[PDB]
Amino acid sequence: MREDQEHQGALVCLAESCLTLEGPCTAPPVTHWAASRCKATGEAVYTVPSSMLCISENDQLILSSLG
């Protein structure tokens, strides 16, 4: 069982060391774009209808037919 328990304890060690066993939570690192999104939260976000972005499979068909 030494090998088996060692393997399972490796997994358990990774888990528990990663888990916040006690105390308060902590802030992870944040990248440029993520922090900028957090700061800009509330701006009217940009988006586009997929209809405009080539939902026309008929046009796709005759396009791909072209040489």
Partner 1 sequence: PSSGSESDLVSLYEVERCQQLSATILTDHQYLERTPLCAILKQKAPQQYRIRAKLRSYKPRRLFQSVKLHCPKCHLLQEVPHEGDLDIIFQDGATKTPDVKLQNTSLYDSKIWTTKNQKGRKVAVHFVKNNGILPLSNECLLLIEGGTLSEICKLSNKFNSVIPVRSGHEDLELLDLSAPFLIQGTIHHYGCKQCSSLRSIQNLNSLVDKTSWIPSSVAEALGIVPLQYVFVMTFTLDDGTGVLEAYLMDSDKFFQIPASEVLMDDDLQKSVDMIMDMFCPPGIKIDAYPWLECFIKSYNVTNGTDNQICYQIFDTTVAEDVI
Partner 2 sequence: PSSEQAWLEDAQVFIQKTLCPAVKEPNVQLTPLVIDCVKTVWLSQGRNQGSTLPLSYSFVSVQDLKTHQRLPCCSHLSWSSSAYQAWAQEAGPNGNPLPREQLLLLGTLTDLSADLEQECRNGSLYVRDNTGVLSCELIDLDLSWLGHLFLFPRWSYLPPARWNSSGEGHLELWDAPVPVFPLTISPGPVTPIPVLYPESASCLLRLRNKLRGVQRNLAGSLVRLSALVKSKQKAYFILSLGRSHPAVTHVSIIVQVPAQLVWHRALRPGTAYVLTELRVSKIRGQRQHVWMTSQSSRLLLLKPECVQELELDPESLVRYSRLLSYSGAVTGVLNEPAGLYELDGQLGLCLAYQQFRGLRRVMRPGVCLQLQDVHLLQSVGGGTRRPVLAPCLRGAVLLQSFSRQKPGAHSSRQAYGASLYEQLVWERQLGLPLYLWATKALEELACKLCPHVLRHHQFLQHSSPGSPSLGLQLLAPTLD
Residues contributing to the site for partner 1 (CB under 8 A): 4, 7-8, 10-12, 14-16, 18-28, 31-34, 36-38, 40-41, 43, 45-56, 59-60, 62-63, 66
Structure tokens at 40: 């800009």
Nearer Cβ to partner 2 (17/64): 17
Residues 1-20 close enough to bind partner 2 by CB under 8 A: 2-3, 6-7
| Burial 28-47, CB ≥16 within 10 A → b, else e | eeeeeeeeeeeeeeeeeeee
Tell me the closest approach of the beta carbon of residue 13 to partner 1, in angstroms: 10
Residue 37 binding partner 2, by CB under 8 A = no
Gap between the Cα atoms of 67 and 63, Å rounded: 9
Structure tokens at 32: 């440029």
